[PDB]
Symmetry: D2
C-alpha cells in the first residue's frame, strides 16, 4: 500500500493522500 512521510513523497512514489497521527498531517505515498 502506502507509506507516510514528511515533507513529501520520495522518488519512485507518488502522493495519493494524507495520514494523521502523532498530531500531524503526513503525505500518503503510494
Amino acid at each position: 500500500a502506502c507509506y507516510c512521510r514528511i515533507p513529501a513523497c520520495i522518488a519512485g512514489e507518488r502522493r495519493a493522500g494524507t495520514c494523521a497521527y502523532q498530531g500531524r498531517a503526513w503525505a500518503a505515498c503510494c
Copy 2:
C-alpha cells in the same frame, strides 16, 4: 456530518475520526 477541532470534541459531539489539513491532525467530531 463532522467538524474538525483541536484538541478534542466539545459537549454534544463524539469523536469518530481524524482530519488532516494545514499540517496537523484534528479530531473529527460528530
Copy 3:
C-alpha cells in the same frame, strides 16, 4: 474551522485536506 463532506466542498468553502472516519475519506472544507 473545517467541515467534512463528500463528494466535494460547497460554494463558499475551499478544500484544504481530508477527514477519515466511518471507513471513508472525506474532503475537509474550510
Copy 4:
C-alpha cells in the same frame, strides 16, 4: 514511519492513526 493497511495493523505494528486516500480510511500502522 507508518504504513497504511485495512482492516487493521499486523503483528509487530501498533495503530497510531489513519490514512485517507483512494476514497477510504486506512489504519496507520507504526
